Design a protein around this nucleic acid. Structure first.
Lengths: 297, 146, 83, 108, 67, 119
RNA sequence: CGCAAGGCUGAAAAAUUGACGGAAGGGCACCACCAGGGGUGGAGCCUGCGCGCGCGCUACACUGACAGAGCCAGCGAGUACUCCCUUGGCCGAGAGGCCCGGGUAAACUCUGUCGUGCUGAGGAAUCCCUAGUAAGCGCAAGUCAUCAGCUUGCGUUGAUUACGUCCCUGCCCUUUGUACACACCGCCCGUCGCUACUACCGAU
């Protein structure tokens, strides 16, 4: 099994590098197809390449399929997108506190298909090993400061990305009394994402919305009574968890049911939780000059 | 200030502030090493009063000096002599004439006067591979040491 | 119970969400308050606006539970710093 | 340009030294010495990251023919207290037969 | 944030990934499994189907039925 | 290629052909038909053979030694011993080619690593 | 540069597809039952959140103290690491450097010496927990966010009791679809809307 995970990760990295070179060529081939249909004259370096024309005659059709959106990009999520229900386990750090364990339970209840695991004495490579051995889609690690959580680590499996984020303004479910709160409904939640516009924003949108099981698309625009909101300002994604009734065709009553975060991501690594030496995709550039001026996501 | 304990990035810095009130005022400030390592004041330290934790860019050394560059405003003085020469006037002297008259030497700091620095050639230690990694890596790249 | 179920039950009690009444049922309603109760509903079913303890009081004394509003307090303090 | 600058424009700015109350701690590391320190650390970490990749992606069933003429790195249990991960090499000495040692001892 | 949630819910647009059919490729119409010139282009398409049947049989037999 | 570019059966059989060749390990990408133009190659088949793929997996040192070892019969692919040095190892059986049960080559590797368990 | 760029005005629907339920039957849950375990809550310290609240930390004796004997880990190597500040004296024209004072485990096992002695294990509640899990123990690191009033790893020792049931509290779903043989079941129920037609009532 382990040889298959290593081999498939190496094949994925090689295919991504080949896609970089092929994109450098296919930016030139899309000018030849647009000039053929519209008749505007093109560059001589493009029109006088015999290899480009000879291979263009075979590779028209994938460019047309990408224009129509009929195919999907080579990704770690596009293999099993809406086919499998993504199972995900939430774990603490090594010796958790009682409020960290209740918070772990609360963000377990945020996902309708998640499970929680007691860490105890569990070495982190064997944690990764057991996740790949039970075909989990995601793990989420939690770190507390002193009864208040300060970091999440959302890792996608078998070889997918980590998003490590630091938590702020955490208001737990376990602070309000049982007369006012109650047992959270476990229905498949709607999701809304607000303010993600860069390709890095669509990356974090993908690795956050593939944590939830896929919604049945027959009548999802009106059915379902539970929503989860990820909205970012100043690249600190703030998340709420509401439950709603549609009290009229023009009005809706919301009710806050879950914990509130404003998590800020500081590391997105193309590689799982065990790989400390995985190649990072983005990291929070503090101690640079304009790293506080520039806004990502 | 001066480093007190130095970890990989977070160093504790001692001889800069006098109290946690002053550190709480200067929380988040851009601290800097003489070498060029940037950093940020993170948190006041409890048990030695006046120290703090500052997370730097890379590892600083105990020989380094950690500076914070603030900008203090200076107001000019509101003095005005008229040079009424036909009547007579008192002329305020210069600092050199004042020092030569009332016999006080000019302030000179020996830590401020420039010196020649004897730099030895920096030689670093060889690579120290750990035992478990050096026993786990394969045959074509195994380390051979007699 | 759930927050969804108790929200639906309280809105059915306040008559905001129930079945589509006929004109005769509206005649009965015009033959025989609700905003004052909707304010309490929108305060009770959004409990994260204010800070509460879960345990209740440590020692019960009987003599004749919102303990603070962090959102309103932070906005008030930021207005003081703006001024 | 370079002709539109005086000699006082060209004059070098001197470097301050470590304070004399603190000279026992060593030299005051400035940008040049820091660049040397950072280059050496980035080089050593690059070699160690490549060694960790090579130790992770290792076939457990690999078979070179030098394995029949080399002693492996072993483990701490098999080797003992004298266990480094380095494969031991030969110093050139060899176990010497009795006729040649008879010749050498007659010479001595 | 609350008004953003109310606007999305009312004019309901949700960014959840939707459950797609696992056989959208081979069965694009989604038929139910129970009781139930251009001729040049059709001849070319049938020739490609015949060629692919032969070539897929050869490639599976050459990989020795691991496919 | 000779089909028109917006054709459904052209697109479906392009994806089928590229997925089949990438699953057999001949092509290294599954997103270009020019790979089947000038990258499918008898050398690509011949390097998906067994002694070359175990030379790449470093089960042997050279393709000559690998052909000698799989003629002497130390190598199984999966669960069955393989005596034919032309068995084309696909991309998901390159994870299952390993030594046989009572192999002297396996005893040599374990004796080098000092893990020779005689049980 | 041109259009946008002229105020019956003065803040707080759709529906033959819709709105809300009920009854029966299933599935699941240490936010449920059942059996146990463990926190917090009592005293002190303090981060944090808004004097209060918890989260950690410490003290509180049979599981004792003293003296011996023996025997066990794993992660950890950037010419790099240092706990203060001072009484004196040395060599110091002067700045400093010296010297002398003051403030690779724990555990475990075995063998002896003494014997409960301000020398007292936390109420109502509330929360969490089902196997290398709860709980004890130390060692190491400090990785661009968080974290020294601590954080995260790493090894060591390692149980009791459930592992059934939807009876309580709930959550999800069936009563439409999504496949065909055997085999089984056999028109779930209410209050309204909307549409089509039919006739009625009374002003214009």
């Amino acid at each position: 099994m382990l040889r298959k995970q290593a081999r498939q990760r190496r094949d994925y990295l090689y295919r991504r590098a080949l896609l970089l070179r092929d994109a450098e060529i296919a930016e030139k081939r899309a000018k030849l197809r647009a000039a053929l249909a519209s008749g505007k004259p093109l560059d001589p370096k493009i029109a006088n390449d015999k290899e480009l024309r000879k291979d263009f005659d075979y590779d028209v059709s994938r460019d047309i399929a990408k224009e129509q959106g009929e195919i999907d990009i080579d990704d770690e999520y596009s293999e099993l997108s809406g086919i499998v229900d993504p199972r995900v386990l939430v774990t603490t750090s090594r010796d958790p506190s009682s409020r960290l364990m209740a918070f772990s339970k609360e963000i377990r209840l945020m996902f309708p298909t998640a499970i929680r695991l007691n860490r105890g004495n569990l070495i982190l490579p064997d944690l990764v090993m057991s996740a790949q051995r039970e075909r989990l889609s995601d793990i989420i690690l939690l770190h507390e400061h002193r009864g208040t959580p300060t970091a999440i680590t959302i890792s996608h499996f078998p070889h997918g990305p980590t998003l490590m984020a630091s938590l702020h303004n955490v208001v737990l479910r376990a602070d309000i009394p049982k007369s006012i709160k109650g047992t959270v409904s476990e229905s498949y939640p709607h999701l809304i994402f607000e303010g993600f516009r860069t390709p890095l924003g669509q990356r974090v949108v993908k690795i956050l919305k593939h944590l939830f099981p896929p919604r049945d698309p027959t009548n999802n625009a009106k059915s379902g009574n539970r929503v989860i909101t990820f909205v970012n300002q100043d690249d600190c994604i703030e998340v709420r968890h509401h439950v709603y009734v549609r009290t009229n065709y023009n009005s809706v009553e919301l009710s806050e049911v879950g914990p509130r975060f404003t998590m800020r991501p500081f590391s997105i690594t193309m590689g799982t939780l065990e790989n400390k030496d995985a190649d990072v995709e983005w990291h929070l550039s503090q101690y640079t000059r304009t790293g506080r001026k520039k806004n990502y996501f | 200030g001066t480093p007190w304990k130095i970890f990989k990035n977070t160093a504790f810095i001692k001889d800069m502030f006098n109290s946690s009130l002053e550190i709480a005022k200067f929380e988040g400030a851009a601290i800097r090493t003489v070498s060029g390592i940037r950093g940020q004041i993170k948190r006041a330290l409890s048990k030695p009063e006046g120290y703090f934790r500052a997370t730097f860019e890379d590892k600083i050394l105990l020989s380094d000096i950690v500076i914070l560059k603030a900008w203090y405003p200076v107001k000019p003085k509101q003095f005005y002599n008229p040079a009424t020469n036909l009547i007579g006037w008192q002329s305020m002297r210069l600092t050199g004439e004042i020092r030569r008259a009332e016999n006080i030497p000019t302030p000179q700091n020996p830590n401020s006067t420039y010196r020649k620095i004897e730099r030895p050639e920096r030689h670093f230690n060889p690579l120290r591979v750990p035992k478990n990694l050096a026993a786990e890596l394969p045959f074509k790249s195994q380390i051979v040491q007699t | 119970g759930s927050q969804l179920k108790r929200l639906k039950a309280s809105l059915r009690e306040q008559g905001l969400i129930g079945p589509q009444k006929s004109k005769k049922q509206k005649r009965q309603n015009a033959n025989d308050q609700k905003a004052e109760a909707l304010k309490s509903i929108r305060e009770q079913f959004n409990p994260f606006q204010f800070k509460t303890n879960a345990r209740g009081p440590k020692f019960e004394v009987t003599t004749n539970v919102i303990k603070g509003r962090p959102e309103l307090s932070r906005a008030r303090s930021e207005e003081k710093r703006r001024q | 340009m370079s002709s539109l600058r005086h000699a006082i424009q060209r004059r070098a700015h001197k470097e301050r030294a470590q304070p004399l109350e603190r000279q026992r701690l060593g030299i005051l590391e400035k940008k040049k010495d820091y660049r040397l320190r950072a280059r050496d650390y980035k080089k050593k970490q690059a070699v160690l990251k490549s060694l960790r990749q090579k130790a992770a992606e290792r076939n457990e069933d690999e078979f070179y023919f030098g394995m029949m003429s080399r002693k492996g790195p072993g483990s701490a249990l098999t080797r003992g207290k004298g266990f480094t991960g380095t494969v031991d090499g030969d110093r050139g000495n060899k176990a010497l037969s009795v006729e040649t040692v008879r010749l050498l001892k007659t010479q001595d | 944030i609350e008004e953003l949630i109310k606007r999305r819910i009312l004019a309901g647009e949700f960014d959840e990934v939707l459950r797609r059919r696992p056989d959208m490729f081979g069965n694009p119409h989604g038929v139910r499994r129970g009781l139930v010139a251009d001729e040049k282009l059709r001849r070319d398409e049938e020739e490609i189907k015949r060629m692919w049947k032969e070539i897929s049989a050869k490639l599976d037999a050459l990989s020795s039925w691991h496919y | 290629s000779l089909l028109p570019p917006d054709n459904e059966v052209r697109r479906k059989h392009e994806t089928l052909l590229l997925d089949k060749l990438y699953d057999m390990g001949i092509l290294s990408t599954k997103a270009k038909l020019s790979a089947v133009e000038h990258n499918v190659t008898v050398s690509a088949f011949a390097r998906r053979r067994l002694p070359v793929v175990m030379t790449r997996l470093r089960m042997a040192e050279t393709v000559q030694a690998a052909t000698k070892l799989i003629e002497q019969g130390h190598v199984r692919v999966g669960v069955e011993e393989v005596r034919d040095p032309a068995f084309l190892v696909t991309r998901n059986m390159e994870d299952f080619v390993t030594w046989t049960v009572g192999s002297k080559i396996k005893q040599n590797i374990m004796k080098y690593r000092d893990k020779l368990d005689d049980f």
